[PDB]
Amino acid sequence: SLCGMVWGTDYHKQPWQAKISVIRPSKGHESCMGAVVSEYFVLTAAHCFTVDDKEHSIKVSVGGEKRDLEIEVVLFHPNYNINGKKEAGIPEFYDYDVALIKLKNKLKYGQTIRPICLPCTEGTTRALRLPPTTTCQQQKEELLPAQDIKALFVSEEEKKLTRKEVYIKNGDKKGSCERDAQYAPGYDKVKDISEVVTPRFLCTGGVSPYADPNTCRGDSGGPLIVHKRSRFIQVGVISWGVVDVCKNQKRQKQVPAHARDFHINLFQVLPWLKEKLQDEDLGFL
Numbered sequence: 001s002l003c004g005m006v007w008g009t010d011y012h013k014q015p016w017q018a019k020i021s022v023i024r025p026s027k028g029h030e031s032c033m034g035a036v037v038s039e040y041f042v043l044t045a046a047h048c049f050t051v052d053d054k055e056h057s058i059k060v061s062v063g064g065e066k067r068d069l070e071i072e073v074v075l076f077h078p079n080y081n082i083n084g085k086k087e088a089g090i091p092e093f094y095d096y097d098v099a100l101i102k103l104k105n106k107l108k109y110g111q112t113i114r115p116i117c118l119p120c121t122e123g124t125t126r127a128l129r130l131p132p133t134t135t136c137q138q139q140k141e142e143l144l145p146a147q148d149i150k151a152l153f154v155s156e157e158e159k160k161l162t163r164k165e166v167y168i169k170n171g172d173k174k175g176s177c178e179r180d181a182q183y184a185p186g187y188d189k190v191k192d193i194s195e196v197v198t199p200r201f202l203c204t205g206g207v208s209p210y211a212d213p214n215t216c217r218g219d220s221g222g223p224l225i226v227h228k229r230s231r232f233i234q235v236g237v238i239s240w241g242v243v244d245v246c247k248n249q250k251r252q253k254q255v256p257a258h259a260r261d262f263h264i265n266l267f268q269v270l271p272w273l274k275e276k277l278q279d280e281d282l283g284f285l
């Protein structure tokens with residue numbers, strides 16, 4: 001497929017966006033986002049589901065449609081466990097916070113429903129107009145160089161999408177961005193912050209080099225996207241933030257230099273993506 005290409009407003013501009021609603025909602029468990037990655041699969045965050053009967057715990061829609069898609073199986077990353085660091089006084093642990101929604105029915109791609117490119121695929125090689133000798137490490141050097149990286153995510157409200165520009169701190173601001181996990185309630189006592197911020201995470205947010213918009217809980221599972229030569233490449237999955245600016249803008253205005261968002265780096269979950277998606281004709285390297 002020609003991934004990460006516009007085929008207009010809202011889903012005409014971001015046709016890989018998926019909207020997830022929690023069926024039995026509660027405070028902190030209302031909504032998520034995801035990304036169409038193939039005709040049968042939506043990529044999202046594991047923490048969007050109930051661990052029991054995952055398949056009946058959400059509805060998912062694409063293309064800004066009213067209709068819900070039939071969910072056949074939900075596949076959690078096997079390393080994911082929100083309770084895995086409770087003994088270290090870490091109440092919620094978001095390492096490997098990624099899940100695949102396997103749809104019963106094949107999606108029909110159109111103007112409002114298209115797949116996004118994934119890292120280390122032939123789709124991304126072609127989208128970035130790279131040669132057939134291209135390796136996964138070269139794609140990583142192209143997409144996540146050691147610098148502040150221009151990127152974007154999308155928030156949804158009543159079928160309307162808002163694209164937000166953010167910068168991934170992957171250069172000399174990386175350590176500062178990661179250490180700011182201590183501003184997140186519940187992570188403020190851990191002595192070694194690399195216990196919460198593992199190598200699975202990319203870090204956005206803050207006011208340098210630009211005033212990054214922050215994520216909210218309902219953005220969980222949405223794609224973190226790099227825009228290159230009119231193509232959109234997913235590099236991350238929104239996992240967790242220091243401050244939910246939908247609920248607590250007050251707190252972000254108190255600590256704006258430290259208001260970071262954390263995303264699962266898809267380059268760090270490739271063996272799982274490659275295995276689960278091996279029959280989807282995406283041509284993993």
Ligand SMILES: CO[C@H]1CCN(Cc2c(C)cc(C)c3[nH]ccc23)[C@H](CO)C1
Pocket residue numbers: 091092184185186187215216217218219220221238239240241242243244245
């Ligand atoms: C361990 O708890 C800390 C991390 C998770 N935070 C909530 C949260 C989740 C779950 C997911 C996304 C995308 C969020 N975006 C902004 C906030 C936020 C809480 C409260 O900020 C503090």
